[PDB]
């Protein structure tokens, strides 16, 4: 996977793309009008998909009868219905934010992020024969935004479309740097014109992350060494140690 420094750098890149800061935002909650209900915490866990539900389940197992327990029935129904409804979540956004610096709540987010996003990203990277830290970091960011579902905008859909355009994966012998450039092209196209119309506005405004990642490739920094300087018209300027 990613070593300690590389994984941190990958996460600070994602943090810029999600929240405009290298400091991971565990307390973030916002309705983006992308069909996903509330988008929450470090991974943008959403109430329509079930992943915010998973955070609250994990937190509730660790800390019974916490301030978010009462939201489980509605979070469960929203996941079942794949629903954008936030009208039955009064107080949820404030309660989530109030736990931004809580050790157990952050740990629950880290656990769900590891299980739903980091480990699947590293597994699919292994399946594709990816060897570079930068390519693995791109996969990690991709699954966080696109999800690991079966839909045409999903992480694995992008991998398969890239493999077809490139004539194979790096495991098949395709040059990994060329493959990753094609992957970034495929992801850009998906963000500009996703199959899911609900997410068009938000994803079109996120395409700059593709160029930030490509700029790392163009510096030939495939090991994701630091410091990294991000210079983005959309996001601003950042240093990542």
Curated annotation (Swiss-Prot):
Superkingdom as given in the UniProt entry: Bacteria
Function according to Swiss-Prot or TrEMBL: Aids in the defense against invading fungal pathogens by degrading their cell wall chitosan.
This protein's name: Chitosanase
GO biological process: carbohydrate metabolic process
Molecular function in Gene Ontology: chitosanase activity
EC assignment: 3.2.1.132
Residues at the active site: 18, 34
Coiled coil found in the keyword field: no
Alphabetized UniProt keyword annotations: Glycosidase, Hydrolase, Secreted, Signal
Catalysed reaction equations from the record: Endohydrolysis of beta-(1->4)-linkages between D-glucosamine residues in a partly acetylated chitosan
GO CC term, one of those recorded: extracellular region
Family recorded in the similarity comment: Belongs to the glycosyl hydrolase 46 family.
Localisation per UniProt entry: Secreted
Protein's UniProt keywords contain Heme: no
